[PDB]
Amino acid sequence: EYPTVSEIPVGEVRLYQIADGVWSHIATQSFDGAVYPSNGLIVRDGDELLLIDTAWGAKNTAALLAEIEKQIGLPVTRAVSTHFHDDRVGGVDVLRAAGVATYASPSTRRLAEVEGNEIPTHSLEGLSSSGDAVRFGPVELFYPGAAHSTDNLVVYVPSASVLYGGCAIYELSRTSAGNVADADLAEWPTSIERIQQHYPEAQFVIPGHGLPGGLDLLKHTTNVVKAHTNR
Ligand SMILES: Nc1cccc(-c2cn(-c3cccc(C(=O)O)c3C(=O)O)nn2)c1
Ligand SMILES: [Zn+2]
Ligand SMILES: [Zn+2]
Numbered sequence: 001e002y003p004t005v006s007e008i009p010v011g012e013v014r015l016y017q018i019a020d021g022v023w024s025h026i027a028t029q030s031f032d033g034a035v036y037p038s039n040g041l042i043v044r045d046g047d048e049l050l051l052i053d054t055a056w057g058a059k060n061t062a063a064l065l066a067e068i069e070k071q072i073g074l075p076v077t078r079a080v081s082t083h084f085h086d087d088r089v090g091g092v093d094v095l096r097a098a099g100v101a102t103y104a105s106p107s108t109r110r111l112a113e114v115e116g117n118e119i120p121t122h123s124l125e126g127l128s129s130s131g132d133a134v135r136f137g138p139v140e141l142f143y144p145g146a147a148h149s150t151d152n153l154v155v156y157v158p159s160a161s162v163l164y165g166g167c168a169i170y171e172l173s174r175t176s177a178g179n180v181a182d183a184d185l186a187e188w189p190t191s192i193e194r195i196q197q198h199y200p201e202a203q204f205v206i207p208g209h210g211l212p213g214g215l216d217l218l219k220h221t222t223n224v225v226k227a228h229t230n231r
Contacts, residue, residue: 078100079103080124154169192221
């Protein structure tokens with residue numbers, strides 16, 4: 001069973017195996033007075049591992065590297081951050097010092113900089129325009145357009161039919177918007193439509209926070225975002 005927020009002490013990291021060579025990592029962090037869960041992804045890349053997003057903070061991310069060594073043993077060699085917030089780049093300095101090459105789009109790195117957040121080392125090219133995709137080892141990276149943030153990326157594992165939507169996708173139980181201070185509410189439904197046109201056979205959809213499900217997370221997220229708009 002997928003771990004939930006009350007089951008994970010802040011500072012601990014769970015791994016959840018989704019398919020052969022695909023796991024999610026789950027951690028918790030206090031933010032604005034409450035403790036939230038947060039998801040990232042781990043994708044096997046032959047004798048290496050590709051990491052998607054930190055575990056939200058230097059300490060959680062150190063524990064993430066430890067859990068990966070304990071439970072998988074393959075080396076993390078590259079990391080991608082899917083947007084510029086703490087829950088995606090917080091812990092990038094730990095990844096870098098540990099020898100992980102850290103990547104993000106130029107927009108993400110620039111917004112992280114403006115924000116005073118840790119900054120992935122390398123820019124990802126080819127993701128500047130809505131609908132752009134690029135191959136990155138065992139995954140495709142997709143910029144669906146502005147949504148949760150103007151820079152947010154989604155990650156697809158074609159061999160596993162795993163779509164990692166990051167914080168642009170909500171879990172099914174979520175009935176209100178959440179942190180939208182950096183969102184583009186008007187653009188967000190359109191960006192989700194691009195995701196749906198691109199990955200309609202996704203069998204496992206992972207939100208930035210909370211429980212994975214099926215393709216219905218997409219439409220559901222559109223509904224919640226619009227409802228937040230209309231009031
Ligand atoms: N340094 C900085 C600046 C602004 C925002 C953040 C941040 C906000 N985070 C969130 C906390 C709880 C929930 C969510 C969500 O996706 O709904 C987020 C988020 O990613 O915005 N995570 N990092 C950090
Ligand atoms: Zn965010
Ligand atoms: Zn988030």
